[PDB]
């Protein structure tokens, strides 16, 4: 018998991460619709190449609510931790050996039993792990400072780039994988490889700060940010489509029931309620 080790990642509005209070508990708060926010204690590190000091923290959001629902449905207990290197996960050459980093590496090494995060389903990862059916259907878009005018993914300041207009995504992410694998995107990939950010929050802040002119990322995140911060807009629009899934090892005994529960939640309105609570208000 064992508690599930759940790994997640900071990524608003799917996973908020906040300090505990002095006594080690999470502050009581309420949603926009008046209901209490469910929070869980999640351990993780508070700069690349430095030692990582793990401390208890508070986690909540769309994905944490989804976790609580799966746990109650399928009757498992769990402990949540934040991925130690802060990355979603890619497979990089080391040497002809390869390794996965990020949440993918923690799941494959046994440090995690389940990835519950806005984790994009793609061919590269599905070779190594099991994904559920998608709990969110979305795609990629482009975030810019209000007033910046670019048409989209085919705009010549992206396709014929210079140092005059800088764009980027998140290191060791599915967007990084996407641009690296499609030869037709190699001009964009070589430009971004010089400017990619360690996390989405840092990249978004860099757009607000006019140090990054366009950020290419998940539309589910970017449209939420633009709904909250009026100096930011997305520019259009879904140029690639993908979904987020729960990640498990291929020999997981939970994998069938997790997918059935995802499907039931789309069908009975639970997933829309989460959209209403965390995403679309």
């Amino acid at each position: 018998s064992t508690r599930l080790k759940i790994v997640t990642i900071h990524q608003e509005p799917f996973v908020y991460v906040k300090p505990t209070m002095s006594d080690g508990t999470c502050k009581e708060e309420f949603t926009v619709n008046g209901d209490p926010v469910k929070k869980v204690i999640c351990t993780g590190p508070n700069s690349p190449g430095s030692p990582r000091h793990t401390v208890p923290q508070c986690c909540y959001g769309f994905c944490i609510d989804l976790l609580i629902k799966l746990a109650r449905t399928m009757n498992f207990t769990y402990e949540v931790h934040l991925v130690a290197d802060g990355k979603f996960g890619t497979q990089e050459r080391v040497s002809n050996k390869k390794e996965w980093n990020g949440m993918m590496g923690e799941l494959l090494s046994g440090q995690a039993d389940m990835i519950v995060a806005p984790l994009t389903i793609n061919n590269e990862r599905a070779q190594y792990i099991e994904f559920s059916k998608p709990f969110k259907y979305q795609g990629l878009t482009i975030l810019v400072k209000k007033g910046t005018r670019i048409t989209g993914i085919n705009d010549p300041r992206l396709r014929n780039p210079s140092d005059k207009f800088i764009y980027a995504t998140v290191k060791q992410s599915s967007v990084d994988i996407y641009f690296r694998r499609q030869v037709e995107l190699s001009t964009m990939y070589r430009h971004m490889e010089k400017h990619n950010y360690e996390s989405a929050a840092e990249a978004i802040q860099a757009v607000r700060d006019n140090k990054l002119h366009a950020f290419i990322w998940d539309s589910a995140v970017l449209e939420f940010e633009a709904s909250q911060k009026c100096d930011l807009v997305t520019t259009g629009e879904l140029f690639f489509r993908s979904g987020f899934g729960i990640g498990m090892r291929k020999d997981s005994p939970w994998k069938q029931n997790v997918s059935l529960s995802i499907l039931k939640s789309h069908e009975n309105g639970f997933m829309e309620d989460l959209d209403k609570t965390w995403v679309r208000y």
């Binding site: 389903i121 793609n122 061919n123 599905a126 998608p134 694998r181 690639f240 789309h266 069908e267």
Partner: protein, 277 residues
């Protein structure tokens, strides 16, 4: 390595045509057979050679090349997509459950009750439940009071679906009063329903999102639209249905994800699913 595969006509995902009276399928089409009865006083019938094309047929061609299999494609005759009737699945789902087909390809919606009896590939077309109306009809969604409490309005709103598929199953489970109200407006098929909307005999048609988005894109005059700027309730996808424990699922899943990631899928969407509107 030679696989029985079942499908069902639903443009533009599967489109069925007569064979050249050459008996050869040409162009972008693949052979598909249909069992046609001789009469209604015998179980005898004939296989009729037809030709099949469409978004899903293009997917099957790519999977056959990539995963490396050949197939004999046939059109389902016992039901349509799949419904559980007295605890027995019919339609494409039933053909897979009862091991007459190795896989089912078409406009086949992934839902929880089907996933209990077949394995589904990853979704390769996003879909759900949408609502088609005449442009400017004010309906918030499925949760609109005009749908949920229809006799609160005088005269009441007239809306329906095509019974026996995933959309009617969802409504029956979620909105019991709406479901029993709307069966009076059951439509025999998508073409009948669009004619009913255009002539004012129906106010809304509730149906598969991907098919309605396709029809709205090609509506003469762009008068019929889906509500909420193409809003989808109960997001899901079409999926390839396989027997539970199928040894083909892993490869088929990896191949579909490869087509999505390398651009092959958006090519088929441009080729088959674009519309002027």
């Amino acid at each position: 390595n030679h696989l029985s595969i079942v499908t069902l006509e639903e443009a533009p995902f599967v489109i069925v045509e007569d064979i050249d009276p050459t008996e050869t399928c040409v162009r972008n089409t693949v052979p598909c057979r249909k069992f046609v009865k001789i009469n209604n006083s015998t179980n005898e019938g004939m296989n009729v050679k037809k030709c099949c094309k469409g978004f899903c047929i293009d997917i099957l061609k790519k999977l056959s090349r990539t995963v490396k299999f050949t197939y004999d494609l046939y059109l389902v005759t016992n039901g349509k997509h799949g419904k559980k009737v007295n605890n027995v699945w019919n339609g494409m789902i039933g053909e897979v459950v009862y091991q007459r087909a190795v896989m089912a390809v078409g406009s086949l919606t992934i839902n929880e009750e089907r996933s209990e009896v077949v394995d589904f590939s990853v979704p390769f077309v996003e879909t759900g439940i949408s609502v088609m109306v005449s442009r400017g009809t004010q309906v918030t969604g499925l949760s609109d009071k005009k749908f949920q409490r229809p006799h609160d309005y005088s005269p009441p709103f007239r809306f329906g679906t095509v019974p026996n598929g995933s959309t009617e199953r969802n409504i029956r489970n979620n909105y019991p009063y709406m479901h029993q109200y709307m069966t009076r407006f059951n439509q025999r098929g998508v073409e009948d329903a669009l004619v009913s909307l255009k002539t004012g005999k129906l106010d809304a048609f509730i149906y598969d999102a991907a098919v309605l988005n396709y029809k709205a894109g090609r509506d003469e005059g762009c008068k019929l639209v889906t509500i909420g700027s193409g809003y989808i309730f109960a997001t899901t996808g079409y999926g390839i249905a396989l027997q539970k424990g199928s040894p083909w699922k892993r490869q088929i899943d990896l191949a579909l994800l490869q087509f999505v990631g390398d651009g092959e899928m958006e090519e088929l969407e441009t080729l088959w699913l674009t519309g002027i509107c």
